[PDB]
Amino acid sequence: SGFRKMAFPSGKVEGCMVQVTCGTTTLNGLWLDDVVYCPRHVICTSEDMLNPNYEDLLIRKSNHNFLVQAGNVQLRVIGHSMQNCVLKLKVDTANPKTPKYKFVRIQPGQTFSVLACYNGSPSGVYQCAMRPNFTIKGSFLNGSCGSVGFNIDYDCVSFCYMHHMELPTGVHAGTDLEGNFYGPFVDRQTAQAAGTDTTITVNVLAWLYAAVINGDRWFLNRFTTTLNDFNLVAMKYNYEPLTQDHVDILGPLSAQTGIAVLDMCASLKELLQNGMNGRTILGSALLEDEFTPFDVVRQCSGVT
Amino acid sequence: SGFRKMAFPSGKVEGCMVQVTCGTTTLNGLWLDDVVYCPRHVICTSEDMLNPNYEDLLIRKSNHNFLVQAGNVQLRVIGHSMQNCVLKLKVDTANPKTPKYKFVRIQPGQTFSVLACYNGSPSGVYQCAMRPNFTIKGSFLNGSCGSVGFNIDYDCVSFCYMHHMELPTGVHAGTDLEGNFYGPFVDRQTAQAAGTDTTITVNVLAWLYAAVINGDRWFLNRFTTTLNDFNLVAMKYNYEPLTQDHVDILGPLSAQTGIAVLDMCASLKELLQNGMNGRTILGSALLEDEFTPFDVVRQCSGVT
Numbered sequence: 155s156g157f158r159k160m161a162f163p164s165g166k167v168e169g170c171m172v173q174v175t176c177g178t179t180t181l182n183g184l185w186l187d188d189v190v191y192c193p194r195h196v197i198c199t200s201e202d203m204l205n206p207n208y209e210d211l212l213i214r215k216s217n218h219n220f221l222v223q224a225g226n227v228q229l230r231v232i233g234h235s236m237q238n239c240v241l242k243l244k245v246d247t248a249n250p251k252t253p254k255y256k257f258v259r260i261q262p263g264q265t266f267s268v269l270a271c272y273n274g275s276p277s278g279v280y281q282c283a284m285r286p287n288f289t290i291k292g293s294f295l296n297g298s299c300g301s302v303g304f305n306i307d308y309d310c311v312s313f314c315y316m317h318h319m320e321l322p323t324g325v326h327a328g329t330d331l332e333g334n335f336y337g338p339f340v341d342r343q344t345a346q347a348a349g350t351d352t353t354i355t356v357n358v359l360a361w362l363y364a365a366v367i368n369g370d371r372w373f374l375n376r377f378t379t380t381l382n383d384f385n386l387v388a389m390k391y392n393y394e395p396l397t398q399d400h401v402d403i404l405g406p407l408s409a410q411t412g413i414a415v416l417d418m419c420a421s422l423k424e425l426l427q428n429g430m431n432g433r434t435i436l437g438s439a440l441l442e443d444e445f446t447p448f449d450v451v452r453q454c455s456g457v458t
Numbered sequence: 459s460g461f462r463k464m465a466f467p468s469g470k471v472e473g474c475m476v477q478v479t480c481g482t483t484t485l486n487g488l489w490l491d492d493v494v495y496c497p498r499h500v501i502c503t504s505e506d507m508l509n510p511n512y513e514d515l516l517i518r519k520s521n522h523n524f525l526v527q528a529g530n531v532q533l534r535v536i537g538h539s540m541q542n543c544v545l546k547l548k549v550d551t552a553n554p555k556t557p558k559y560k561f562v563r564i565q566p567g568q569t570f571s572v573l574a575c576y577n578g579s580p581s582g583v584y585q586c587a588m589r590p591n592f593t594i595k596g597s598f599l600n601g602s603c604g605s606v607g608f609n610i611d612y613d614c615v616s617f618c619y620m621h622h623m624e625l626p627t628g629v630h631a632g633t634d635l636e637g638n639f640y641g642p643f644v645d646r647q648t649a650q651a652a653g654t655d656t657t658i659t660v661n662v663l664a665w666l667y668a669a670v671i672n673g674d675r676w677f678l679n680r681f682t683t684t685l686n687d688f689n690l691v692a693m694k695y696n697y698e699p700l701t702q703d704h705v706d707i708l709g710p711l712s713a714q715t716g717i718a719v720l721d722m723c724a725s726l727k728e729l730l731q732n733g734m735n736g737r738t739i740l741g742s743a744l745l746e747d748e749f750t751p752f753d754v755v756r757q758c759s760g761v762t
């Protein structure tokens with residue numbers, strides 16, 4: 155029992171982190187096979203970020219201007235290419251620690267682990283979610299760019315995020331490993347404000363199921379609701395609409411606890427309308443939305 | 459910016475996890491040098507746990523009854539000894555992945571990362587704290603025993619915890635790596651109830667400093683207090699007494715923000731007395747106490 159904001163074990167990803175320096179900019183890169191992926195803004199100075207023309211800035215860079223260091227040893231860059239907002243630096247040595255991997259583009263509401271790095275060195279690992287406004291609420295300082303987000307399925311790491319920027323509101327924006335930003339964000343220091351950060355309803359319900367599995371049951375009420383009635387209340391509280399797809403995804407948790415998905419919806423409806431009244435659920439005083447139904451099943455079954 | 463419940467990168471510890479089976483009990487062990495450490499209750503059946511005489515049960519076990527498997531390969535046990543509540547299984551092969559390590563006994567209020575394991579395989583990593591009642595609020599299922607808690611200082615892992623049991627209230631108990639339990643808990647399935655789970659005051663203050671550093675400043679008030687006045691309020695709310703030692707430990711965070719420690723104490727006093735009023739601090743609706751002042755400085759400076 156017990157339910158924690160658990161990240162994937164990070165060893166497989168630690169073995170891929172390298173330092174990338176271009177000019178006076180130093181950030182992190184991900185070394186998989188004989189390619190090192192990093193934010194294309196490594197070619198920029200802080201002044202360039204106001205109005206960068208990446209293609210033009212990249213013309214002034216050659217293979218020898220990209221300093222790639224894995225641990226305390228230098229890697230030889232034999233090629234470089236820009237793919238959307240990432241640079242692919244071809245090196246003459248395949249990473250001997252390359253795990254089985256995939257590049258995936260996640261959808262909002264999906265969770266992943268971030269391995270925060272500085273100078274190619276891992277500092278920490280935390281769990282986060284792709285917000286419905288395509289930002290992430292991470293913990294990143296200057297130098298953390300190129301840190302990656304991932305999920306692990308047994309021995310295959312699915313890389314889904316690479317850190318690029320922090321918006322003025324303290325939220326984070328980045329790309330998948332093909333260099334395409336999540337949401338409408340661009341790697342330009344211009345006016346970029348995030349949309350509404352709605353709550354991931356299906357995730358809250360999964361976490362309410364985790365609460366019941368782990369003994370926190372005070373919020374279970376005598377009521378039920380419909381998808382439409384629930385959604386009328388959820389809209390009012392800036393919660394994402396709950397679909398029949400989400401109900402289907404919560405089927406296994408509903409089966410494990412014996413609580414129908416719409417009954418949990420009614421409990422969530424009362425929590426939104428009445429508040430917590432100074433009570434907690436799984437040690438939290440708010441409704442947690444950064445656990446997917448899959449994460450709940452995973453943690454409650456002990457998948458390795 | 460951003461402040462997350464960040465765990466240490468787990469690779470160094472993943473390279474030490476092995477599976478230990480004795481009879482029908484399978485749990486995890488920590489392999490450092492040519493020794494595998496594991497809970498002594500590996501020699502017990504579920505029935506033995508009611509009234510185990512470990513010395514007597516251990517007489518019926520020989521080196522060949524301890525099956526140690528690292529990945530998919532078996533390790534040869536050439537010796538075994540009981541040290542308090544842990545078994546030390548000597549193997550004929552030193553772990554080639556042994557990091558620089560120390561065994562440390564932490565004090566309540568200190569935080570550490572747990573690498574939850576099943577069958578010698580890592581499932582996840584989360585951050586937790588030694589509670590003032592010597593329990594930990596972890597996420598452990600049957601089979602997770604032998605999972606370890608640790609801290610990392612650059613390249614040296616300080617192992618501080620090994621998981622042994624879950625009490626009826628869903629809280630967890632375990633030992634340091636010399637096999638001595640934290641608190642009064644014993645590896646016997648008898649009546650064991652935890653004491654008051656008080657709040658780690660110095661940790662809450664450190665996290666309030668992290669909030670100010672990361673832009674959440676709404677709770678800063680026009681007041682100050684004394685250690686004695688603060689402690690009168692803190693006692694009332696089941697908060698640990700704040701000492702001059704704690705004030706000294708918060709000195710660097712006080713310097714970084716320009717907020718005197720006693721001014722932050724007065725802000726914390728108003729938060730306890732008035733509540734949050736439906737507001738949040740660093741995405742939490744309660745006062746977080748599982749970040750030490752050292753963790754706050756570490757995360758806010760990007761120590762690798």
Ligand SMILES: CN(C)c1ccc(N(Cc2ccccc2)C(=O)Cn2nnc3ccccc32)cc1
Binds near residue numbers: 340
């Ligand atoms: C190339 N260099 C010198 C560079 C310099 C600055 C940046 N920016 C500014 C920026 C914002 C928004 C859009 C385009 C740029 C970042 O936001 C980078 N960043 N990422 N996470 C961070 C956390 C704390 C501090 C900085 C952080 C990127 C690149």
Ligand SMILES: CN(C)c1ccc(N(Cc2ccccc2)C(=O)Cn2nnc3ccccc32)cc1
Binds near residue numbers: 483502507598624648
């Ligand atoms: C040796 N075997 C068969 C064994 C069998 C059971 C246990 N107990 C019971 C127990 C409680 C308190 C005191 C002494 C025993 C545990 O609590 C072990 N444990 N640890 N974390 C857990 C999370 C979920 C479920 C079980 C968990 C230990 C050993």
